[PDB]
Amino acid sequence: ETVVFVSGATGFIAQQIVKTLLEAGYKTIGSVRSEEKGKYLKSLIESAGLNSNLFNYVIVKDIGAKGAFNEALQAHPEVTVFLHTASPATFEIHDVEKELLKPAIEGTINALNAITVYGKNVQRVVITSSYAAVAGFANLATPGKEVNEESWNPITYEQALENPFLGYIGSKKFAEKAVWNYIEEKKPKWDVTFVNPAFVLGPQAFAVRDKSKLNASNEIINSLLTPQQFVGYFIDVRDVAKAHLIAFEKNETVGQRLLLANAPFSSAGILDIIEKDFPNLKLDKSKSPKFEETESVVNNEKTRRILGFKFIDLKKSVDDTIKQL
Numbered sequence: 001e002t003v004v005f006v007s008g009a010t011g012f013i014a015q016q017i018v019k020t021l022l023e024a025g026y027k028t029i030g031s032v033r034s035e036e037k038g039k040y041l042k043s044l045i046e047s048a049g050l051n052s053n054l055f056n057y058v059i060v061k062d063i064g065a066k067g068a069f070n071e072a073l074q075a076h077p078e079v080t081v082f083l084h085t086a087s088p089a090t091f092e093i094h095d096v097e098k099e100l101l102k103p104a105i106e107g108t109i110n111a112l113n114a115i116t117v118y119g120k121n122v123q124r125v126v127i128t129s130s131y132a133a134v135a136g137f138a139n140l141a142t143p144g145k146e147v148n149e150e151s152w153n154p155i156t157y158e159q160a161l162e163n164p165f166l167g168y169i170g171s172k173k174f175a176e177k178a179v180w181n182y183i184e185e186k187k188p189k190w191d192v193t194f195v196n197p198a199f200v201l202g203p204q205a206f207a208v209r210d211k212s213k214l215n216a217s218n219e220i221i222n223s224l225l226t227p228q229q230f231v232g233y234f235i236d237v238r239d240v241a242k243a244h245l246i247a248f249e250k251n252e253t254v255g256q257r258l259l260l261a262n263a264p265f266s267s268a269g270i271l272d273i274i275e276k277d278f279p280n281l282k283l284d285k286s287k288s289p290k291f292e293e294t295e296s297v298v299n300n301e302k303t304r305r306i307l308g309f310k311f312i313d314l315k316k317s318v319d320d321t322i323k324q325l
């Protein structure tokens with residue numbers, strides 16, 4: 001009876017969501033940008049021993065476009081759960097409002113409109129948001145201070161306009177705000193849950209494509225193998241994926257923001273792990289790091305209690321990432 005729609009299903013996080021849904025036996029519909037991406041994903045699922053009869057794809061070439069999901073939800077009236085995992089990709093930015101904040105905000109509204117009008121059987125929407133909407137960064141960072149599932153990044157709309165880096169952060173905050181504004185205003189019959197991941201690391205659900213460059217967050221790792229250093233909170237992608245299932249499965253997740261952050265990390269600390277665990281790689285050397293004393297402290301025991309499983313630690317995450325390469 002439960003049919004789960006997953007937007008942008010070929011992505012790094014979304015492929016792990018799709019794999020997790022199928023291991024749990026859920027009928028799954030993934031949106032892909034092309035027939036080839038859909039056939040490719042189905043073949044990955046087949047070659048992994050999963051029941052590929054549980055998976056189908058729909059072609060949605062442009063996920064932020066007006067009405068982009070209208071036809072998919074006509075063709076699949078059985079959808080009861082909609083995991084909106086993806087925001088449209090962005091590239092070289094010249095107009096931060098028009099190229100970053102606008103497509104992010106309008107993309108989520110356009111998706112919510114289509115769900116409300118065409119997804120008449122949808123009971124739960126899960127929004128993949130971001131830890132960026134929860135804690136403050138750069139000069140707005142609050143090192144030593146606690147953030148929890150109710151905290152918001154204080155960045156204002158105008159502050160987000162200043163440069164692409166803050167525009168990306170602001171895009172996450174104000175896209176999620178658009179969802180909250182849509183609920184209060186239009187009062188849809190479906191319930192919402194948010195998953196707010198920090199830096200997502202870990203192995204790909206199925207396959208390599210190109211060992212030379214992985215998804216953006218995992219370039220924190222592959223850059224070392226291949227370096228802009230980083231600091232903050234990490235979360236293993238498999239924990240992000242499991243959290244999306246709990247997000248629609250439980251009643252206590254309605255109106256909740258699940259803070260998907262495990263433990264602090266640095267790029268140097270990840271290099272230390274690769275140095276100790278992969279001796280045939282003795283790599284590259286750096287030193288210009290940040291120290292975590294720019295980061296808020298995460299209190300997410302509420303999330304960890306709702307999720308009810310133990311997170312994968314950084315060593316296992318990094319080890320599993322390297323093994324695929």
Ligand SMILES: NC(=O)C1=CN([C@@H]2O[C@H](COP(=O)(O)OP(=O)(O)OC[C@H]3O[C@@H](n4cnc5c(N)ncnc54)[C@H](OP(=O)(O)O)[C@@H]3O)[C@@H](O)[C@H]2O)C=CC1
Pocket residue numbers: 008009010011012013014032033034037060061062063064085086087088089128129130131196197198199200201215216217
């Ligand atoms: N990874 C992280 O650390 C975090 C990621 N997120 C968010 O989660 C989402 C995906 O994360 P991740 O999986 O890591 O990124 P990936 O690049 O691995 O996945 C990107 C996905 O977005 C799809 N996509 C992008 N633009 C469009 C578009 N215009 N029309 C249709 N499909 C589109 C891609 O389609 P194709 O496969 O066809 O290229 C791909 O499926 C992003 O929105 C990201 O901001 C949130 C918090 C942290």
